[model samples]
Target: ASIFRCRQCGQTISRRDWLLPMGGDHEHVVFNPAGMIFRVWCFSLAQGLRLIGAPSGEFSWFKGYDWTIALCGQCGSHLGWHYEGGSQPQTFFGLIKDRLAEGPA
Candidate 1:
């Protein structure tokens, strides 16, 4: 796997406490809403819209990365919540805050 950077403000994603895998999911640390966009790639592709512009593919929102990741396009601040490819056509990922920096920003 590789590290991805924030496309908006150029901020590097920070480290945060990964909550115990709630429900029946695996355990992994995720960002908070104040640190990253939940869906930057889709908006960029669909001319400011999400999902509608994402490539036609079968993605599982409840499994294998079940959260959205995004950043702000204006202030470069981290936005929040993304619609994953499941459950009525949408899923959400929280923003991370504990381990972010300007060097990556």
Candidate 2:
């Protein structure tokens, strides 16, 4: 049971909590150079959640690893990340990649 925590409000978002939207413009999608699990939560968000609160348009979206994480509940500053599932057991920062999406999507 992996969890995605928000750095701002200290909220926890998990894989099953949210679904990732499809492709985007200007590299709307980010890839995990390490082919990692794309973990996002309190650990990662804490550093960037504040970026979202910055001037209205200062930030649109930020990329990390193999996925894009955003605030799921801005009020409480909840956050969530998008990933297919079954990722390798590698930890980039303080988290591990999902171990679900290892096979074909």
Candidate 3:
């Protein structure tokens, strides 16, 4: 299993989480180039993630979903956003590229 920790304070997020196998040709969505961007790849994790609070605005990129700021549970590091929709039971965590560390789980 692969290990992931917070880049800001090195707090462990997940140990066995795996990355989604998206292709290289997929374009990254730029919510703010000067601030953040998201790759087509995402962690296949449904646990061990922490949200900052509540979602306020609609995520136009995901069509009909709203997003909340995600953070590291132990260290409060800004990780990404957790998106969800009332029309369905699906959810997504769009983590930042450099917000986590690579190592053995």
Candidate 4:
């Protein structure tokens, strides 16, 4: 099965996970061209990811949902944002472009 993993630690976040099209496109971008604009892919569930302590208000590009930091449970590297507080039974996820590899499961 196809998968997505942390390129740095070989940790898996998308062990046979399904790709979700939350908007018109699954791929999304935040506007900050001058410094570190994000290009992320959205999904619903992942097996190899864990959230850090305390959720806060930060780069909440999708302001409808509160954003929290996502980390690879094994390595100390930051991966993406975990989203909550939307009209659904599940939370949303987004991983940045450069940190992972869809290197298969």
Candidate 5:
């Protein structure tokens, strides 16, 4: 298992968990309308993270998508989102690039 913390506050973000890789066969770098690129990972579940708000609308990123603002549970920094799609396990966490720092082993 690996640990990730908030970049700004050094607070525990995704602690003691397994995280998917970035830029591989399954994972890819995505961009937003504003041209912000993000390397996303698909995790089975996440900890030390919380949803900031309710999902606003349908996100075209995935087949069954509901995106909400995610925050660091400790520092309230924007992390990513608790993405719930129409897939097995139903819920997964999306950790965006540059928001997380590697924590101690």
Candidate 6:
């Protein structure tokens, strides 16, 4: 397993939140609206980040997944996004690669 922490506050994001498959890939450099471009890694789950705002699929990077703003629970830094989809069910994290710093496990 790998360890991920918030670059701003060093808050532990997740111990189990390692890289995972999303849209058949593990990493993505997404061009977002409002001039935001982020190189992100897909994690199956992020247990330590704070999620705010209702999820929305408008101009979603992941096609069908709704994107929600996610932040560092301790510092409130913009960490990445949480994506949710399926009337039947599914979710994952799209965490910014620069916002997070990998650490020894």
Which numbered prediction scores highest in lDDT against the true structure? 6
* Model 5 global lDDT (CA atoms, 0 to 1): 0.67
Q: Estimate each model's TM-score.
A: 0.28, 0.22, 0.68, 0.83, 0.77, 0.88
Question: How would you encode candidate 2's per-residue C-alpha lDDT over 4-97 as one tens digit per residue?
Answer: 4443443443333232322221113323446533353212122232122322211223422333343435443423333222233111122222
User: For each candidate, C-alpha RMSD in Å?
Assistant: 11.4, 12.9, 3.7, 2.4, 2.9, 2.1
Which candidate ranks first by TM-score, i.e. highest?
6
lDDT of 3 by residue, 1-105 (tens): 377777777777654345543233212455653564554335546345688777755534555667788878777777777777634335656667666776775
In model 6, state the lDDT of residue 82: 88
TM-score of 1: 0.28
Model 4, residue 50: C-alpha shift (Å): 2.5
Model 3 regions more than 4 Å off: 15-17, 21-27, 33-41, 46-48, 57-59, 86-89
Instruction: For candidate 6, list the clashing residue pairs, or say none.
Output: none
**What lDDT does model 6 reach?**
0.82
Pairwise lDDT winner, candidates 2 and 3: 3
User: Candidate 1, residue 20: CA error in Å?
Assistant: 13
Provide the lDDT at 39 for model 3: 49
Question: What is the C-alpha lDDT profile of model 1 across 54-100, one tens digit per residue?
Answer: 42223322343354434444344544334455443244343332222
Query: Is candidate 4 or 6 superior in lDDT?
Result: 6
Give the clash total for candidate 4: 0
lDDT of 5 by residue, 1-105 (tens): 267778888777665456644224335567777887887666656677768767654544655767777888888887776766556546666777578887575
lDDT of 4 by residue, 1-105 (tens): 388888789887874356677767778987543677788888777657779877655656765777778988888677888888765624788777678887645
What is the per-residue lDDT of model 6 for residues 12-96, given as tens digits with 9 covering 90 to 100? 8864445776767778998876787889898877767889989998988876789899999899999999889843237878899
Mind sharing the TM-score for model 6?
Answer: 0.88
For candidate 5, the C-alpha RMSD (Å) to the true structure equals 2.9
User: In model 1, which range of ten residues has the least summed lDDT?
Assistant: 40-49
Please give the CA lDDT of all the candidate structures: 0.33, 0.30, 0.60, 0.75, 0.67, 0.82
